[PDB]
């Protein structure tokens, strides 16, 4: 279902990382497989050549936490008007306080020790269920 269209029609884009995280762009190829591309440090940008009808999403390169692009999940390059590139603003979402707490804890405790923590079993499951690109694709289908 979710896959780039093989249009072969170029589209110039700016990836602009307005987050404090190191960013990993992910191109969904013609069979729907996620393909990683080089990372962007916080506050940096890249001018890149993509194509009309292609699908991208964006992640934290180290924890795989999900990020937003022009306020939403998926970004699809469109027609360039007047030879101007399409802007792709990558930002932090307003995470729930719960999901933020999980991020920090995951970054402090090694996965082998989640169980040694003093919390209810369903929070152990919430910690072990770290963000994953495959799951989010299944969700968004």
């Amino acid at each position: 279902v979710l896959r780039s269209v093989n249009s072969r029609e170029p589209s110039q884009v700016i990836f602009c990382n307005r987050s404090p995280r190191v960013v990993l762009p992910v191109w969904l190829n013609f069979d729907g497989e996620p393909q990683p591309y080089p990372t962007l440090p916080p506050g940096t940008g890249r001018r890149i050549h993509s194509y009309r009808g292609h699908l991208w999403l964006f992640r934290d390169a180290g924890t795989h936490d999900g990020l937003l692009v022009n306020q939403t999940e998926l970004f699809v390059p469109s027609l360039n008007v007047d030879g101007q590139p399409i802007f792709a603003n990558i930002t932090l979402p307003v995470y729930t306080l719960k999901e933020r707490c999980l991020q920090v804890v995951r970054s402090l405790v090694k996965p082998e020790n989640y169980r040694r923590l003093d919390i209810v079993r369903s929070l152990y499951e919430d910690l072990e269920d770290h963000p994953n690109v495959q799951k989010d694709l299944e969700r968004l289908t």
Binding site: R18, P20, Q71, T91, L92, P93, V94, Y95, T96, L97, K98, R100, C101, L102, V104, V105, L108, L117, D118, I119, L123
Partner: protein
Amino acid sequence: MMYVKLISSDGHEFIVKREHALTSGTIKAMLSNEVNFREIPSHVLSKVCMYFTYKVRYTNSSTEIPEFPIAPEIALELLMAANFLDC
């Protein structure tokens, strides 16, 4: 402007807008003008109140969003309280 009182386990009394507090479905229920929390110390409940302010200021804003900060000392207790309050 309506306000409500949220009270920590150690007696600290925090006073916030009614609109902000209703971010939590759990608090919405405990009202439908004061609420006592017997498990939540003030060093956690203050951070919860700051999250309300943060969420309402940055929800659906096209400006850049800063990270909501959490000290390692308070991360576990805060996790438990956010799970309970559903925020």
